[PDB]
Amino acid sequence: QKPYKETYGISHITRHDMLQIPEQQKNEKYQVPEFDSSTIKNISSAKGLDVWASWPLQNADGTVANYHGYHIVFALAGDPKNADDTSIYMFYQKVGETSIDSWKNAGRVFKDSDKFDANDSILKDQTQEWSGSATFTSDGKIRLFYTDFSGKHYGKQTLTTAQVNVSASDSSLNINGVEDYKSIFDGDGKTYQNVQQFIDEGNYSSGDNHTLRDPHYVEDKGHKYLVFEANTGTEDGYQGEESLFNKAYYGKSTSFFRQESQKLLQSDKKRTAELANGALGMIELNDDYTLKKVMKPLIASNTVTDEIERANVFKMNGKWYLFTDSRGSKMTIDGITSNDIYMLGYVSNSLTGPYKPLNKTGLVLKMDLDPNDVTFTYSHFAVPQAKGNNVVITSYMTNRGFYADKQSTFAPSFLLNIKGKKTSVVKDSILEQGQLTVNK
């Protein structure tokens, strides 16, 4: 294979940038702060469930919505004893409240029968509900986006939407049901990998890792978009042996390409790297939330990793910020270890790019605690605020199924300062568990 260079007109998480992170991450400005285990509580309304990846009901710009006096948070939850038991529950608090004890449980968004009543071929094969986002429409509706996962069809993941009908009173919120419940996107082969392409490889025992999940709603100039975790397709730089010879994925220089590519080809990570073709994808939606246009990815991570999760994007003080989470254990970069887990971040003058790295390398947050640590956090997510230079970082705390008495729960939130192309964790900015806004 001859060296070549092709960007496919999109941005890229390069080997050179990633290689800088091990030295850089020793700086406290890029570190998830240490939390105090004796302040940590289970979500009391969730009655012995693990509650992990969660997201707020947001306005179109990403700020936290006020639904008839309440904040709403959707979260994956299930039986700690059953790793494949995952559904979306809806929690809520009166605006102004901050304690984890303020979060009431409206129960599951969906009935088991809803996927059948939807008259949706893909939905009737669903076995779990994985993460997404939720927006509060201009006509006052709760518009959910989430990932339909099918264990019966080799882990197919499909971007899916529903309207959640919720009655509000002075005292409680109550889910009456859903409507407009439909598959929107399951990949197209050319831009984003579909499940058949995963099956073509030999599915799980191939080492490939197919993703199409964590859809995030955002608008710009009245146009509606989802930005999501995916993998590339055949026309925007696919996985394969040929991919290791594309200098676009290396960055820096040809000297660096030669050196780094010959090390990678000689390493035990060659096959992993060939399979790695993560992407943060984008589609425009119609006004009824169906698919308008498949768009080019904002960024891809060919060779580095197959798994860039919890896609997030918003405009803040004149610039666009794009984030994703990723485990060091699934990466191929020298010096990044199986303990390292990241939130990576990118910046642009436009929603559709081009995106360049925050803090020169992409590093925004690093968390390297032992999986057994009660204060281990995952699924970090930057929640934009109405004003100022801070966003709020939410995450879940405590690994699923690890401890009988300590379940996955809302992590203490904290502040991340953002200005220009730089971020820093705000010193001693730890808030309540699950707190969504600075303003009370």
Residues found near Ca ion in the complex (CB under 5 A) = 208, 231, 239, 275, 277, 306
- The Cα–Cα gap between 90 and 166 comes to 10
Which residue lies nearer to Ca ion by CB, 63 or 277?
A: 277
Which residue lies nearer to Ca ion by CB, 24 or 234?
A: 234
Contacts of 204 (CB under 8 A, 6+ apart): 154, 155
Cβ 73 vs Cβ 89: under 8 Å: no
Residue among 394, 303, 388, 297 at smallest CA distance from 346: 297
According to DSSP H, which parts of 105-191 are helical?
Answer: 114-117
User: Shortest gap between Cβ of 186 and Ca ion (angstroms)?
Assistant: 16
Which residue lies nearer to Ca ion by CB, 80 or 328?
A: 328
User: Shortest gap between Cβ of 260 and Ca ion (angstroms)?
Assistant: 20
Which residue lies nearer to Ca ion by CB, 192 or 410?
A: 192
- The Cα–Cα gap between 85 and 234 comes to 33
Burial string for 254-282 (b: 16+ CB within 10 Å, else e) reads eebbeebbeebeeeebbebbbbbbbbbbb
Residue among 279, 202, 195 at smallest CA distance from 238: 279
Which residue lies nearer to Ca ion by CB, 100 or 276?
A: 276
User: Shortest gap between Cβ of 245 and Ca ion (angstroms)?
Assistant: 17
User: Shortest gap between Cβ of 209 and Ca ion (angstroms)?
Assistant: 6
The β-bridge partners of 105 are: 91
- The Cα–Cα gap between 21 and 116 comes to 47
User: Shortest gap between Cβ of 230 and Ca ion (angstroms)?
Assistant: 10
User: Shortest gap between Cβ of 204 and Ca ion (angstroms)?
Assistant: 12
- The Cα–Cα gap between 343 and 321 comes to 12
Burial string for 21-31 (b: 16+ CB within 10 Å, else e) reads bbeebeeebbb
Which residue lies nearer to Ca ion by CB, 279 or 282?
A: 279
- The Cα–Cα gap between 393 and 22 comes to 22
Cβ 308 vs Cβ 278: under 8 Å: yes
Which residue lies nearer to Ca ion by CB, 114 or 274?
A: 274
User: Shortest gap between Cβ of 243 and Ca ion (angstroms)?
Assistant: 10
User: Shortest gap between Cβ of 296 and Ca ion (angstroms)?
Assistant: 18
- The Cα–Cα gap between 266 and 268 comes to 7
Which residue lies nearer to Ca ion by CB, 194 or 359?
A: 194
User: Shortest gap between Cβ of 247 and Ca ion (angstroms)?
Assistant: 20
- The Cα–Cα gap between 5 and 14 comes to 13
Exposed, middle or buried: residue 363 (CB in 10 Å: 0-12, 13-18, 19+)?
A: buried
12 sits in which H/E element: strand 11-12
User: Shortest gap between Cβ of 357 and Ca ion (angstroms)?
Assistant: 22
Which residue lies nearer to Ca ion by CB, 165 or 267?
A: 267
Which residue lies nearer to Ca ion by CB, 277 or 332?
A: 277
